[PDB]
């Protein structure tokens, strides 16, 4: 028993991380057979940060611009293109610690680890959630673009999140392994903002069954709820609407637990409604919707990989 | 910016975890060079699992009793010894993936990252803490025994805790890599508890730098307090008392926010005594005690590992 915020073990994605260096900007890249991946923010210069022309900047640059280095192991460029907002370098030597491997782009309320890294050397390992707003609220310094966000599933590590840049509220944004920004975002420094996030339904239901699974009960109720009476409520706090798919993915925790979906939006209502009160639970004084219903399950039951 | 429970990059530590079957008991075991470590009540039977002689049990051990599998291949036992509660099961190979490593045993309130595995095969990370009873809160189910607990320091692995088991509470217990347990516990099923822990003061100190170098400043104030007089409040909340020293390794977060110690521990006074009235600390409505010092400058800095 016990319950943690558990990431992924990183080692697959450890031995793909390098520094990829043009000009006076150096960031992480990841390296997957013979290509590098990295942001194309890589090509700004600190003048033309503002409204950058990234065809514009690319045409410009030749294949000995990019310094790739992998451990202390110069890696030569043969190519490049830019497809979205990340970079595709070529090089003459493919990655022979390439894991198996899957580009996938998550909906918002999914969940994913970390692997931050500085200079193409990972720094430490934590587990995200994709906020309904499109940020994900990270660790990330001066240094850190290029880091990757991912899933692993039995020997295959799905790559979802490639990191960018930091919004003015300190929360983070970035792209899928093909560049395509999570949200509205554009890899400019401009006027962007977060916009109004709102708490995973789904998944501070999926942690309350966590709890039960682990020996929290205290917050249960008799009552119940219709689905439609439970989202009158969830609106008012912030909360995103339960559509019955959720319901449906909250089914095997259900049934581990004995207690009914709806039974348990009835009793988040009335946590919503008083409080916690004083109490706990799960370790955390605040409702947690970082965890999804397939997390709680691989964590409860003891899913590895290989 | 930002501020994540990190762990470390556990990828080092994934090379070095095989599967240690005995009778019809299987856990994890660590491989470094030609030992494998895992712990000795591997080799009780669900029937001597209250009073076990463990050194009885074990010269009635041959090497073929033990069965090592690293992925899916078979390690051979040519030796075995029992130093204090680990098992240490001489191989034929050497593990080509051993890492620089150290074991260490470390003083309650110090973090490691934990390397959750089942069946040799690693199933998660995340970081604990050393809590001042000497348990740790875990998240281990049946079949996590072996598990092993770290830090890494630049290339080097500093390998500290291996699981053994679950106190009634719901917690964990365990041992340092040659075999002592922390704290008063013992392998065998008998009436152990936990024992009152207590908030590691000097951490939750860490962590209110970390929320000030992360532009959380609601609960600073103008006042000040002596250390003795800090102690008499921590005291009453079940605080560890805060000692010269830790004062002095808060030196460092202290000069970087300008926010004197015993200032900050005014603060950790007030919040003690009126709770935090709704807000939030670094996204936790708790005082959080799992970050050393160490951890909030690792983080907040950059530091790589290699
Ligand atoms: C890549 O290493 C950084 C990561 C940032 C630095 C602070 N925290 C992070 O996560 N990315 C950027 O600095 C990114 C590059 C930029 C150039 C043109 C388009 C994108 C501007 N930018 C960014 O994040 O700007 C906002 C910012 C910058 C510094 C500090 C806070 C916020
Ligand atoms: C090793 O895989 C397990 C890990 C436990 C299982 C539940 N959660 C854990 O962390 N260790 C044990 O089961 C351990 C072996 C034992 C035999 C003689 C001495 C030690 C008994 N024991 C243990 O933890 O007993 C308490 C317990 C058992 C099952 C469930 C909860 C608590």
Redesign the pocket.
Same mark, same amino acid.
């Given at each position: 028993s016990g319950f943690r915020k558990m990431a992924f073990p990183s080692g697959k994605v450890e031995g793909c991380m390098v520094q990829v260096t043009c000009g006076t900007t150096t960031?992480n890249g990841l390296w997957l057979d013979d290509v590098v991946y990295c !942001?194309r =923010?890589v090509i700004?210069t600190s003048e033309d940060?503002l409204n !950058?022309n990234y065809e514009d900047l690319l045409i410009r640059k030749s294949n000995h611009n990019f310094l790739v280095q992998a451990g202390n192991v110069q890696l030569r460029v043969i190519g490049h293109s830019m497809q979205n907002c990340v970079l595709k370098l070529k090089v003459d030597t493919a990655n022979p610690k390439t894991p198996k491997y899957k580009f996938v782009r998550i909906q918002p309320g999914q969940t994913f680890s970390v692997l931050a890294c500085y200079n193409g050397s990972p720094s430490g390992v934590y587990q995200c959630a994709m906020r309904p707003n499109f940020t994900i609220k990270g660790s990330? %310094?001066?240094?850190?673009?290029g880091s990757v966000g991912f899933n692993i599933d039995y020997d295959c590590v799905s790559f979802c999140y490639m *990191? *960018?840049?930091? %919004? !003015?509220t300190g929360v =983070?944004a970035g792209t899928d392994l093909e560049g395509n920004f999570y949200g509205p975002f554009v890899?400019?420094?401009t006027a962007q903002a977060a916009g109004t996030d709102t708490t995973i339904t789904v998944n501070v239901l999926a942690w309350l069954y966590a709890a039960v699974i682990n020996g929290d009960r205290w917050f249960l109720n008799r009552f119940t709820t219709t689905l439609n009476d439970f989202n009158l409520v969830a609106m008012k706090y912030n909360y995103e609407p339960l559509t019955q798919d959720h319901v449906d993915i909250l089914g095997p925790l259900s049934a581990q637990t004995g207690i009914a979906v709806l039974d348990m939006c009835a009793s988040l209502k009335e946590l919503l409604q008083n409080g916690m009160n004083g109490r706990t639970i799960l370790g955390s004084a605040l409702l947690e919707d970082e965890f999804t219903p397939f997390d709680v399950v691989r964590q409860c039951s003891g899913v590895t990989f290989q």
């Open positions: 960031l !942001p =923010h700004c940060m !950058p990330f %310094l001066n240094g850190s673009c *990191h *960018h840049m930091e %919004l !003015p =983070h890899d400019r420094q």
